[PDB]
Each structure stands twice: as structure tokens, then as C-alpha cells.
Amino acid sequence: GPKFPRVKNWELGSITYDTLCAQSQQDGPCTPRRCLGSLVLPRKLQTRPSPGPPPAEQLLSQARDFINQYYSSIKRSGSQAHEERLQEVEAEVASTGTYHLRESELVFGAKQAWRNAPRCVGRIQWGKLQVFDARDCSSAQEMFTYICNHIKYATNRGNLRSAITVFPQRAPGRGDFRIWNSQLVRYAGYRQQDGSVRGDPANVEITELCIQHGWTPGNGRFDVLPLLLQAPDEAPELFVLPPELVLEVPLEHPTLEWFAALGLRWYALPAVSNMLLEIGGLEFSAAPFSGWYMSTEIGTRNLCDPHRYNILEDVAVCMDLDTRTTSSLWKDKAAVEINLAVLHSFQLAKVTIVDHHAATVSFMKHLDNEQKARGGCPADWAWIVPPISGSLTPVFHQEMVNYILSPAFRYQPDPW
Amino acid sequence: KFPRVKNWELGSITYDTLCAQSQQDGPCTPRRCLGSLVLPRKLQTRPSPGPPPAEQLLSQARDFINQYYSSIKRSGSQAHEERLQEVEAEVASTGTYHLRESELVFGAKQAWRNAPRCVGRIQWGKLQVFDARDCSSAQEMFTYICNHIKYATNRGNLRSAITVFPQRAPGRGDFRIWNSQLVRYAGYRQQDGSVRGDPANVEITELCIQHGWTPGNGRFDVLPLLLQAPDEAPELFVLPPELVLEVPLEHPTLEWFAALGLRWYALPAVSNMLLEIGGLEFSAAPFSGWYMSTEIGTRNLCDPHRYNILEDVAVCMDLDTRTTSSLWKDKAAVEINLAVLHSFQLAKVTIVDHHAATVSFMKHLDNEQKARGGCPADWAWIVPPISGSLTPVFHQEMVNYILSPAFRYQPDPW
Numbered sequence: 001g002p003k004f005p006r007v008k009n010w011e012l013g014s015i016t017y018d019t020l021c022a023q024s025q026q027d028g029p030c031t032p033r034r035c036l037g038s039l040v041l042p043r044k045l046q047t048r049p050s051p052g053p054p055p056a057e058q059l060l061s062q063a064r065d066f067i068n069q070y071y072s073s074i075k076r077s078g079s080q081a082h083e084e085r086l087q088e089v090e091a092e093v094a095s096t097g098t099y100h101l102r103e104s105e106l107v108f109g110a111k112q113a114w115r116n117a118p119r120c121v122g123r124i125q126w127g128k129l130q131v132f133d134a135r136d137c138s139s140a141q142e143m144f145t146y147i148c149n150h151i152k153y154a155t156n157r158g159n160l161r162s163a164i165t166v167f168p169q170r171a172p173g174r175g176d177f178r179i180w181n182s183q184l185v186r187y188a189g190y191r192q193q194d195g196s197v198r199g200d201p202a203n204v205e206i207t208e209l210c211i212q213h214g215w216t217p218g219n220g221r222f223d224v225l226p227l228l229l230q231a232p233d234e235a236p237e238l239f240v241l242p243p244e245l246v247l248e249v250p251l252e253h254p255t256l257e258w259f260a261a262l263g264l265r266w267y268a269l270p271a272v273s274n275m276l277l278e279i280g281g282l283e284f285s286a287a288p289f290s291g292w293y294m295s296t297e298i299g300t301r302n303l304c305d306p307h308r309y310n311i312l313e314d315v316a317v318c319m320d321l322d323t324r325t326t327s328s329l330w331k332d333k334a335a336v337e338i339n340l341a342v343l344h345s346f347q348l349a350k351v352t353i354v355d356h357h358a359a360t361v362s363f364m365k366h367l368d369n370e371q372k373a374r375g376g377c378p379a380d381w382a383w384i385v386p387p388i389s390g391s392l393t394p395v396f397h398q399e400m401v402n403y404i405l406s407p408a409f410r411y412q413p414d415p416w
Numbered sequence: 417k418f419p420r421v422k423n424w425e426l427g428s429i430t431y432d433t434l435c436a437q438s439q440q441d442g443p444c445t446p447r448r449c450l451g452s453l454v455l456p457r458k459l460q461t462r463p464s465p466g467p468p469p470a471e472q473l474l475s476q477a478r479d480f481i482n483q484y485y486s487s488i489k490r491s492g493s494q495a496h497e498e499r500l501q502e503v504e505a506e507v508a509s510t511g512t513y514h515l516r517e518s519e520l521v522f523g524a525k526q527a528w529r530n531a532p533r534c535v536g537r538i539q540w541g542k543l544q545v546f547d548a549r550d551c552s553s554a555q556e557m558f559t560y561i562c563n564h565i566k567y568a569t570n571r572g573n574l575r576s577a578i579t580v581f582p583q584r585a586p587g588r589g590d591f592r593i594w595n596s597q598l599v600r601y602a603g604y605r606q607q608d609g610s611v612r613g614d615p616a617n618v619e620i621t622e623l624c625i626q627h628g629w630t631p632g633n634g635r636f637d638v639l640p641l642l643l644q645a646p647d648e649a650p651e652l653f654v655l656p657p658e659l660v661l662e663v664p665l666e667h668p669t670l671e672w673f674a675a676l677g678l679r680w681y682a683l684p685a686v687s688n689m690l691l692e693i694g695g696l697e698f699s700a701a702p703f704s705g706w707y708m709s710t711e712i713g714t715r716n717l718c719d720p721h722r723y724n725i726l727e728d729v730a731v732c733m734d735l736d737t738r739t740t741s742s743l744w745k746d747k748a749a750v751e752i753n754l755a756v757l758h759s760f761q762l763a764k765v766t767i768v769d770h771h772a773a774t775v776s777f778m779k780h781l782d783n784e785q786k787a788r789g790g791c792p793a794d795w796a797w798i799v800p801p802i803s804g805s806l807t808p809v810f811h812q813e814m815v816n817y818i819l820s821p822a823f824r825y826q827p828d829p830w
């Protein structure tokens with residue numbers, strides 16, 4: 001049949017062929033000999049800091065592909081404007097070694113990067129992204145201003161709006177604009193004398209970096225961390241987010257009245273700030289983006305991972321479950337109630353959130369839309385299927401093809 | 417060259433060097449990963465009307481023989497040398513060769529050990545191997561199969577086993593078991609497309625009927641076996657009821673669960689896969705172990721295209737099925753899995769929960785890292801269908817590749 005990957009949905013028995021993968025221009029980590037699809041950070045995309053200017057011949061090809069993508073999106077491929085733009089880009093790279101995007105090209109590129117993200121289950125929303133152009137930013141202080149405005153706009157008192165703020169692109173010999181923190185909102189992780197951790201263990205390194213840079217630490221379990229912002233060729237500067245700007249939700253349970261006594265909580269805005277946005281070969285090292293949470297991220301991963309808050313046993317004990325044996329399914333029961341508490345609480349506080357059932361059903365719609373629009377959709381099964389009740393959702397039974405398309409969001413090395 | 421493998425829960429790292437011994441290609445390429453696909457597009461097992469290239473077969477045979485003698489610490493011995501000559505001599509003159517029982521036993525265990533989708537491999541060394549290569553008819557296949565079932569069931573104290581029927585031969589038809597498993601519940605299509613029983617077994621149910629079976633009309637009617645000897649139409653055999661151990665499902669605290677009339681068989685025995693050892697192919701080699709509770713409680717009973725009982729259980733529990741956010745599906749699923757564990761435990765039938773199973777698999781990974789420098793594993797199949805990240809394997813990166821001896825899918829015989 002068709003010389004493309006055949007994809008089956010085992011629930012419905014339907015079949016599709018992915019032809020979009022034919023457009024991938026960047027190799028992944030797999031080979032016919034072995035599959036490395038489960039690796040979180042395979043040395044592939046990894047945007048290792050490439051100081052010296054990038055080969056003009058390579059950048060040019062990437063730039064042309066992106067410009068072609070842009071003109072195709074507005075249905076003017078081959079037009080005079082299309083060829084003239086191509087000429088402009090080639091001329092700008094010729095005399096300067098790099099080039100710059102027009103406003104509309106950046107908006108298109110940022111949305112495409114999200115659309116192309118294989119690990120994102122919320123892509124049905126890809127067309128609705130507020131793109132803040134901060135390419136005029138010239139200092140760490142100004143970065144903070146842009147970031148605070150982003151947070152205010154995106155949070156919108158609980159009715160969250162997806163958004164991305166784009167700071168100046170990378171340039172040869174010159175330092176990068178960087179946000180040291182992995183997310184705009186992170187809870188401190190304080191190493192204890194006995195080796196344990198109070199707070200979020202995932203943030204021990206950034207917490208210590210903040211202290212090394214003048215931050216006076218607290219001693220709580222949910223202390224919001226300050227931001228370490230870095231402008232070109234300068235040491236990072238510390239900035240404390242005004243409390244009124246960081247919306248949080250105290251967690252309570254719909255029927256278990258004691259759950260609220262646990263003093264648990266989480267912040268409303270998920271905003272990734274350490275990834276690199278790549279568009280037409282241009283690299284935006286500082287381009288924080290945010291959406292809204294799927295409840296399992298908080299209730300299952302953040303609160304129950306053994307290496308995170310690890311609250312499973314505490315909650316199970318409160319529920320008076322038999323934690324001495326696996327067959328009682330105490331972990332399963334506790335996790336369900338914790339996830340329900342997250343949903344209930346966000347709903348009570350009128351803060352946007354989506355449960356894993358609703359999110360996956362919407363992602364299935366997205367796959368259908370994309371099959372028609374582009375002939376496929378790059379998707380990472382291991383990241384799309386939720387961390388709890390996997391097979392109870394539709395995506396579990398849907399085979400997926402994973403590949404890299406650009407524009408794209410990529411991991412990049414830590415600045416320190 | 418060698419992939420770095422990290423466990424995100426513990427921060428530990430290892431390097432898989434075993435993957436270098438892989439000689440068979442998977443479906444992935446640097447351009448795109450097809451790791452989530454269930455069946456191969458090409459990695460199938462094409463017909464065998466003609467003898468496989470002597471050179472290819474010979475290289476596979478030698479490699480296997482080398483594996484075998486290394487396992488008994490007699491590599492380079494006189495026995496090793498002479499065995500290689502025997503294989504060389506038989507292939508050169510006949511285009512094929514035959515395994516010794518001791519080698520078949522080693523090969524079967526290795527095939528299990530190499531299965532990337534199996535989370536129960538810590539048990540790989542404990543496998544009862546029944547040599548059924550002296551079988552010449554469907555009737556004899558039935559006798560062997562019944563004996564396999566009796567031994568494996570063991571009154572509830574399940575024991576892993578495999579029965580190996582005659583290997584495939586050039587230009588001759590294969591010995592085959594048409595059913596995907598030795599124990600399967602019928603799936604009867606009714607008036608308006610709906611299905612009574614197991615929807616996964618509609619096609620096989622109809623085949624049985626077409627071949628003379630008198631169909632029942634229940635939700636859990638055990639199907640008869642369609643056994644096929646070379647180039648003969650399949651023959652129908654009804655398994656003696658006393659040989660098929662079943663477990664009535666009830667819940668530890670929910671009195672009404674038993675009223676649902678749910679049940680499941682004790683013995684999971686895959687019968688439609690091919691066992692490949694040293695280039696030889698065994699088209700009929702049913703193998704069995706014991707169930708992990710999620711297979712029954714989550715997939716078999718809750719999959720939308722299976723018994724799909726989630727909503728019935730939810731209503732009996734008086735849950736709010738009005739919206740997804742009440743997590744009624746999650747609550748119902750947990751209780752259903754608890755009922756499975758409780759019931760099997762009560763009936764004294766071997767079963768393992770997903771937490772205990774994954775912990776043992778993590779031990780297996782460590783054991784294999786020391787013994788062979790790695791372990792092929794398919795993440796999507798190792799991580800349980802419920803409570804994925806609540807188990808250790810979720811946080812463990814895995815490398816998937818094909819090693820031989822191996823169990824592989826093959827075309828349906830009809």
C-alpha cells in the first residue's frame with residue numbers, strides 16, 4: 001500500500017497513513033537496530049551552545065524552508081512577495097551572517113513550534129496563542145517587566161490564556177538572553193541536614209543558585225522562588241515576583257474534609273522558561289511560554305512522584321489504607337483522591353484546568369484535524385498517555401508516529 | 417554507539433551494550449520512531465514454501481549453537497566443534513537442520529528472556545518445556561495441549577510452560593493453532609452489531625461455528641480449539657470443562673459486585689505466535705505463565721472494545737457519570753482491579769498485581785545489566801495500563817531491540 005507509516009487505532013479499528021513525517025529534516029535518536037523513543041533527553045535536538053557563527057549555508061537552507069512554510073501558510077507560495085522575501089533573507093545573511101523575522105513570521109513560527117511539539121497533549125489549542133514580541137528587550141530589568149506582564153495577561157485572574165514572550169535571538173560572539181529557572185513559578189527545594197528535602201526536590205539546584213546570588217531563603221514547603229534573569233554577557237540578576245501576581249490554589253477534597261488540613265497547594269500557571277524556540281535556523285534562547293494545567297501533572301506527577309513531593313503514603317495513611325502490601329492497591333486509591341482534590345480545588349477557585357479524560361478526547365480530535373490538514377501529527381506516545389488510568393483514555397489505543405518538525409521547541413544546556 | 421540509559425527516579429545511569437548483538441531490524445529510522453505500533457508492517461514471517469538461503473540459515477544456526485555452548489560453559493570444547501559440524505552437514509545436504517532437546521529447552525527460555533514486551537521476565541529461568549516435535553496429527557496436538565493445560569494450571573498453583581510442535585518445513589504447510597489463546601471466551605455478533613461475550617474473539621468464534629461448533633449464548637462461553645496439521649483443514653476440539661479453571665469475580669467489600677456475574681480464566685496461554693530458534697521456526701508453540709491483575713481488571717474488562725464494564729460498575733457504585741472530572745472511570749477501574757486480586761487470592765489461583773510485578777522487573781533489569789550488559793524492553797508495554805507513574809518502570813528509560821531466539825507474530829492461517 002502507501003509507502004508511509006500505517007497507523008492504527010485499536011479501539012475503533014481505523015487506519016491512517018502519516019505522510020507528514022516525509023517533511024522532517026532533523027534526525028531523531030532511533031535506528032533500525034534499536035528504538036530509543038523512551039529516552040527523555042536523547043543527544044539529538046539538544047541545542048548545545050554553538051558560540052561561533054553557524055554555517056551560513058546551513059542557516060540559509062533552514063531560513064528558506066521556513067520562509068517557504070510561511071508563504072505557504074498565507075497561500076502566496078511562488079508569488080513576487082515570496083521570492084522577494086527569500087532574496088531579502090539571503091542578502092541579510094550574506095552581509096551580516098544572520099537575519100531577522102518580520103512580526104507576522106514570528107507569530108506564525110511560535111504557533112507552529114507548539115503545533116509541532118510531539119510531547120504536548122494540549123495541541124488542539126495551538127491556533128490560540130498570544131505572542132508577545134519582546135525582541136526590543138535590552139536588560140535583565142526589562143526582561144522582568146515583560147515576564148510580569150506575561151504572567152498577568154496569561155493568568156487573567158483564573159481564566160488562563162496561552163501565551164509566549166519572545167526575547168532577542170542569539171547572535172555570534174555575544175551572550176544569550178536566558179531565564180535560569182525552568183519555569184516562571186517553582187517551589188524552593190531546601191536540602192536538609194539529614195540529606196532529605198523540604199519543598200520540591202526537583203528544584204534543589206536552582207534554589208541553591210538563587211541563594212548563591214543573594215536570595216534569602218525561607219523554610220517552607222511551598223516557597224515561590226525568585227527569578228534569575230540574564231541579559232547578554234552579564235551575570236544573572238535576581239528578581240522577586242510580587243505575591244499578588246502568583247496565583248495559587250489551596251488544595252481541598254470534595255468529601256474528605258481532612259485533606260485541606262494537609263496544607264497542600266499548587267500554582268495556577270504552568271510556564272516553561274528554559275527551552276529554546278527555533279525558527280528558520282534562528283535561535284530564541286529566552287522565550288517563556290505558558291498554557292494551563294492538565295490535572296494529572298499536579299495530582300499525579302508533582303505530588304506523587306517518589307522524587308517529587310511523594311505524598312502517596314501520607315494520604316493513604318489518612319485514608320486508613322493497608323500500606324503494608326501492594327495488593328491492597330493503596331497507591332492507586334490515594335492517587336485517585338489526590339487527583340480529584342486538584343480538580344475540585346481548581347474548579348472551586350475558578351482557575352482553568354483540564355482533566356486527563358477531557359484532554360485526551362480533545363487530543364484525539366486534534367489528531368483528526370491534523371490528519372486532514374497536514375497528513376499526520378508527530379506524537380510521543382509515552383508523554384501523551386496520562387500517568388494514571390492510561391488505557392481508560394482514548395490515546396492509549398492510538399498508535400503514534402514520532403518525528404521532529406521545525407519550527408520547534410528544544411531543550412538547551414543550562415547557562416551555568 | 418551505546419545508548420546511555422537513565423532512571424529519573426534514582427538518577428542512576430547505565431549503558432546498553434547488548435543492543436550491539438541485534439541482527440534483526442525494528443520499524444524505526446532516524447527520520448521517525450514507530451515504537452508505539454503493535455504489529456510490524458514488514459517484520460512479519462513470510463511463507464516457507466521454499467528453503468531459506470543456506471548461508472543465512474547457517475549463520476543463524478552457528479550463532480545459536482555458539483550461544484548454547486557458552487551457556488553450559490563448554491565453548492570451544494570438542495562437543496561444541498562437533499555440533500557445529502553436524503549442523504553444517506545437515507544444512508548443506510538438506511537445506512535445514514534439527515535441534516537437540518537440550519538446545520530447544522535453552523532456546524525457549526532465551527526467547528522469553530529476549531521478549532521486550534514482557535514484564536514478568538524475572539521468571540525466565542523457570543519454564544517447563546514440553547517437546548512435542550513427534551506430533552503428526554491435530555488429534556495428537558489436542559492431547560499435548562490438554563496435558564500442557566493440566567500441568568500449567570496445577571490446581572491453581574500455576575507453573576510456566578511451553579509446548580513445542582513440529583518446526584516449519586519448505587513447501588509443506590505449518591502445524592498451527594488457530595486460536596490466539598488456549599482459553600478464549602466467545603464473542604457473538606447480534607442483531608444490531610452489538611456483541612455478547614468478548615468482542616476481541618468475534619472472528620475466531622465464527623470460524624469455530626463454521627467448522628461445526630454448536631454455539632452457546634452466554635458472556636463467558638469457553639471456545640473450542642481449532643487445531644491444524646500440515647495442509648489439512650483445521651479440526652475442532654472441545655476442551656474438557658474440568659481442565660479450564662475459572663475464577664468467579666467478587667469484591668472484598670462491595671456486596672453487589674458478585675451480582676454482575678463476571679469471571680475470568682486462570683490460565684493465560686498465547687498460542688498464535690512463532691518461536692524462532694537458530695533460524696528454525698516453530699509455528700505452533702503455545703506458552704503460558706500467570707496473569708498480572710491489570711490484564712484482566714483493566715484491559716480485558718474495561719477496554720472500550722472489550723467487555724467495557726466501566727459504566728455498569730460506576731452506576732452500581734452510584735458515581736457521578738455526568739462528567740469526566742468526577743473521575744468515575746478511575747474510581748471504578750481501581751475497584752474492578754481490586755476485585756480481580758481479591759477473587760484470585762480467594763480461589764487460591766496465582767496472580768500478581770502491577771506494583772509487585774514492576775518491582776520484580778526492575779530487579780530483572782539490574783540482573784540483566786550485570787549478566788548481558790542490557791535488556792531489551794518496550795516501555796509502552798512494560799508500564800501498566802493504570803497508575804503508570806505510581807510504578808518504578810515508568811521512570812526508567814528503556815532500549816528496545818530484537819534479539820534471537822525470539823517470539824514473533826505470524827500471519828493468521830485463514
Ligand code: HEM
Pocket residue numbers: 110114117119120121122123125129162163164289290291292293294297354359383409
Ligand atoms: C493550553 C494548555 C496546555 C495543556 C493542557 C498542555 C499540556 C501538556 C502536558 C500534559 C505536557 C507534558 C508535561 C510533562 O509530562 O512534563 C505538555 C508538554 C509540552 N507542551 Fe503543552 N500544553 C498546553 C499548552 C502549551 C503551550 C501554550 C505550549 C507552547 C506554546 C506548549 C508546549 C509544550 C511542549 C514543548 C511540551 C514538552 C516540554 C518538555 O519536553 O518538557 N504546551 N503540554
Ligand code: HEM
Pocket residue numbers: 524528531533534535536537539543576577578686703704705706707708711768773797823
Ligand atoms: C510468569 C508470569 C508472566 C507474567 C506475569 C507475564 C506478563 C506479561 C504481560 C503483562 C504482558 C503484556 C500483555 C498485553 O498487554 O497484551 C506479557 C507479554 C508477553 N510475555 Fe509475559 N508474562 C509471564 C510469562 C510469560 C511466559 C511463560 C512467556 C514465554 C515463555 C512470556 C512471553 C511474553 C511475550 C512474547 C509477550 C508479548 C506478547 C505479545 O506481543 O502480544 N510471558 N507478559
Ligand SMILES: [Zn+2]
Pocket residue numbers: 030031034035036037444445448449450451
Ligand atoms: Zn523508536
